[PDB]
A paper describes a structure:
Specific [name] manifestations were determined within [name] large [name] ([name]) bound to a single-stranded RNA that forms a belt around [name] protein. [name] consists of 11 identical subunits assembled into a ring with 11-fold rotational symmetry. For crystalline complexes such as C.Esp1396I, whether [name] protein is intrinsically more susceptible to X-ray-induced [name] or whether [name] protein scavenges electrons to protect [name] DNA remains unclear in [name] absence of a non-nucleic acid-bound protein control obtained under exactly [name] same crystallization and data-collection conditions. To monitor [name] effects of nucleic acid binding on protein [name] susceptibility, a crystal containing two protein molecules per asymmetric unit, only one of which was bound to RNA, is reported here. In this structure, [name] bases of [name] G1-A2-G3 nucleotides form direct hydrogen bonds to [name] protein, unlike [name] U4-U5 nucleotides, which appear to be more flexible.
Here, a methodology has been developed whereby per-atom density changes could be quantified with increasing [name] over a wide (1.3–25.0 [name]) range and at higher resolution (1.98 Å) than [name] previous systematic specific [name] study on a protein–DNA [name]. To quantify [name] exact effects of nucleic acid binding to a protein on SRD susceptibility, a high-throughput and automated pipeline was created to systematically calculate [name] electron-density change for every refined atom within [name] [name]–RNA structure as a function of [name]. This provides an atom-specific quantification of density–[name] dynamics, which was previously lacking within [name] field. [name] availability of two [name] molecules in [name] asymmetric unit, of which only one contained bound RNA, allowed a controlled investigation into [name] exact role of RNA binding in protein specific [name] susceptibility. By employing [name] high 11-fold structural symmetry within each [name] macromolecule, this approach permitted a thorough statistical quantification of [name] RD effects of RNA binding to [name].
Numbering used by the authors:
A (entry chain C), C (entry chain A): 6 to 74
B (entry chain B), D (entry chain K), F (entry chain I), G (entry chain H), H (entry chain G), J (entry chain E): 7 to 74
E (entry chain J): 7 to 73
I (entry chain F), K (entry chain D): 7 to 75
Write the structure that this text describes.
Amino acid sequence: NSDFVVIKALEDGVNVIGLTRGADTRFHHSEKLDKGEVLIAQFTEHTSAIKVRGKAYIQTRHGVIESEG
Amino acid sequence: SDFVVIKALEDGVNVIGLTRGADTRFHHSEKLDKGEVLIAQFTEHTSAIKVRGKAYIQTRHGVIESEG
Amino acid sequence: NSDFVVIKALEDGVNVIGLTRGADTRFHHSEKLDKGEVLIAQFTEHTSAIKVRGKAYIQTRHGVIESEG
Amino acid sequence: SDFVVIKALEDGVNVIGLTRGADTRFHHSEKLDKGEVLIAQFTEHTSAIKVRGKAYIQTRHGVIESEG
Amino acid sequence: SDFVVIKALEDGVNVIGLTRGADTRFHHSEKLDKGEVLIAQFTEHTSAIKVRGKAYIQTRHGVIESE
Amino acid sequence: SDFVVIKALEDGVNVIGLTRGADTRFHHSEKLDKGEVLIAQFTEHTSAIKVRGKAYIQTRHGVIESEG
Amino acid sequence: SDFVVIKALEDGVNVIGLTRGADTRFHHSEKLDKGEVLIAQFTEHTSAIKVRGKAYIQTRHGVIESEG
Amino acid sequence: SDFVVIKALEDGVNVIGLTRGADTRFHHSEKLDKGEVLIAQFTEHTSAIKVRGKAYIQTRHGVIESEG
Amino acid sequence: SDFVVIKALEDGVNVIGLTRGADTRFHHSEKLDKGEVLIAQFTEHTSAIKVRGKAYIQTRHGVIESEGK
Amino acid sequence: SDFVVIKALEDGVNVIGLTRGADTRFHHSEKLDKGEVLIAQFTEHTSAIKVRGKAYIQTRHGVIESEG
Amino acid sequence: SDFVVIKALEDGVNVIGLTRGADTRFHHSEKLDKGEVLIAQFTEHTSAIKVRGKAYIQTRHGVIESEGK
Ligand SMILES: N[C@@H](Cc1c[nH]c2ccccc12)C(=O)O
Ligand SMILES: N[C@@H](Cc1c[nH]c2ccccc12)C(=O)O
Ligand SMILES: N[C@@H](Cc1c[nH]c2ccccc12)C(=O)O
Ligand SMILES: N[C@@H](Cc1c[nH]c2ccccc12)C(=O)O
Ligand SMILES: N[C@@H](Cc1c[nH]c2ccccc12)C(=O)O
Ligand SMILES: N[C@@H](Cc1c[nH]c2ccccc12)C(=O)O
Ligand SMILES: N[C@@H](Cc1c[nH]c2ccccc12)C(=O)O
Ligand SMILES: N[C@@H](Cc1c[nH]c2ccccc12)C(=O)O
Ligand SMILES: N[C@@H](Cc1c[nH]c2ccccc12)C(=O)O
Ligand SMILES: N[C@@H](Cc1c[nH]c2ccccc12)C(=O)O
Ligand SMILES: N[C@@H](Cc1c[nH]c2ccccc12)C(=O)O
């Protein structure tokens, strides 16, 4: 039942990086998206923070935001 | 528990479920032909969903479109 | 207490297909609706995704969408 | 639990409960004559409901009509 | 747990409760005469409610009328 | 737990509690005279309420009026 | 739990609590003089509240007025 | 758990807690002088609150004013 | 759990927490000077809050203003 | 669980966490330079937060501004 | 559990997590370069978040901007 974010890649090679939940913080996975693909990604037991690199249109419960490459 | 609506706008749209857990990889790909709709939840096994191909998508945060 | 989807068949032979919950994903049931019949179907312990094939008017909590045969 | 309102607009409308669980089959059909209303929940035993015949239906997602 | 409001618009209206559980049958029918109102929950014993006769009904999903 | 508000619009209005459970019968009838208000919950013992006599009624679903 | 606000519009208004349980009787009668306000919950002991006398009442369902 | 806001509009306003439980009696009377504000919850010990004297009151159901 | 916002509008404002339980008395008085904001919850130990002095107050029920002696 | 946002409008804004429990004193002070933002929850150890210095503050009840 | 969205408006923005509990200290500083977006929860380990550097911030209370150094 956690929140989720919507990431639409606006160019090739966007990275959606999950950061580890817990006392330690590191990248545990980078999902690479190509232009026009959409990832819908939850917060989870393993992921408590999500970093987006590259150009993407993003939706979350607080509205739209855009990352730039 | 949340769900995503996916409407295929062309043949071969691929809805890809990513594994929940410490590891991340795809565990299922459900292909849709033009005009079919898939309403898919997040689950004990799927904590992220990727859409490839042209599709019209509804989530609780609104509509979004994937481009194939 | 789970969410549900309303499906109204707009032609004969519409299939509402339930996909299994869990590590295994497959179709476990396909409900045939003929024109003008309505099915209101929940997500369940056994059904964690629902596929609609054929021409149908669908309502979810996200709004209306239409499937095309 | 959510519920659905079905108002029959002709005689012989059927409101059909489908079994919860790994098996899916009809376990009951409640027949409604014109102008009767049935207000029916989802339950431990009923995880999908089908309506046949002409009726005005309300759910949390709005009005829909079934046609015979 | 949710409830239904029924107002009888004529004499003889029946508000009928249907059993929760694997089996479905009527376990009670409450008769309403014209102008009487019943407010009735879903319960451990009642998972579906049928209205027969002319009445004004309100639920969480808005108004509907039986005839 | 939900409640209903009843304002008596004439003397002798009866607000009648129906028993929760396998059995359905009246366990109590509260008499209201004109201009009296009763605000009454659903409870462990009361799972349906009946109003007889002229009254103004509010619930979560809005206003309704019973007639004598 | 839900609560009701009652403002006495004249002297000697009674806000009466009815017992929760199989039995229904008055357990307490709170007298309000003109202009006093009582804000009163539903509780383990009180599952219905009756107002006698002229008062302005607010509940989650909106305003209603009891009259002498 | 809810609360009520009381602003005293003159000296000596009393905000009175009534005991939760089978018994209903006062328990505490908080004196507010003019312009003072008390913001008071419903609690394990208090299930009803009376205001005596001139005050501006806010609850989840809106504004109401007591008069001395 | 709910909280109240209090902004002091002059020096020497007191936000007083009253004890939760059968006993009612002041257990703490937090002094605020002009311009300072206190955001205070209701808690295991505080079930009523009194404000003495001129202050601008927000709660879930809206704005109210205390006036000093 | 609730949180406040604090934006420092000058150097040396002081966000002060008060200890949760029978005792009240501050257990941590986080200073912000001009333009920095702190987003801080109510927690097991913090049940009141004081802001000293010029800051722009958002909470669930709207915007408020501390002045130094 | 709540999250905040942070979009860096210049290079070198820091998103800093403060420890939950009786002890308060920084336990992690996530550097964002311009145009990158971080969506970060409150967690069992982070009960406050500080942003330093020019960034556009969304929370459930709306938009706020941090201003750089
Ligand atoms: N296996 C990952 C999948 C995931 C969810 N959200 C993510 C965000 C970024 C990267 C991976 C993910 C997890 O359960 O946490
Ligand atoms: N058996 C899968 C089915 C599923 C649900 N949502 C999905 C999204 C993509 C692919 C598969 C799925 C599950 O329970 O997780
Ligand atoms: N027996 C199935 C019935 C069902 C509910 N929703 C569905 C959607 C599609 C197909 C079947 C169903 C279940 O409980 O899961
Ligand atoms: N005994 C059935 C009654 C029922 C509830 N909702 C229904 C919908 C359709 C048909 C029967 C029902 C059950 O509890 O599940
Ligand atoms: N002793 C009754 C009181 C009651 C509550 N709601 C009612 C409606 C009608 C008649 C009595 C009541 C009970 O707890 O159920
Ligand atoms: N004893 C019944 C009373 C009841 C509640 N709602 C109803 C609807 C119809 C008939 C009876 C009822 C029950 O608790 O279930
Ligand atoms: N010790 C009292 C404090 C209190 C809260 N609400 C009140 C209203 C009126 C009087 C006192 C109170 C209690 O916890 O109940
Ligand atoms: N001691 C009573 C106090 C009360 C609350 N609400 C009331 C309404 C009317 C009369 C008394 C009360 C109780 O806990 O139930
Ligand atoms: N130690 C106090 C801190 C506090 C919270 N809210 C208050 C209101 C007024 C005075 C003190 C407080 C408590 O946990 O209760
Ligand atoms: N491992 C950290 C990750 C994190 C979440 N939100 C943060 C905010 C700032 C810094 C780190 C984080 C945690 O679970 O708490
Ligand atoms: N360790 C502190 C961190 C904190 C959260 N909110 C605060 C507000 C002010 C000062 C410190 C804090 C705690 O978890 O409580």
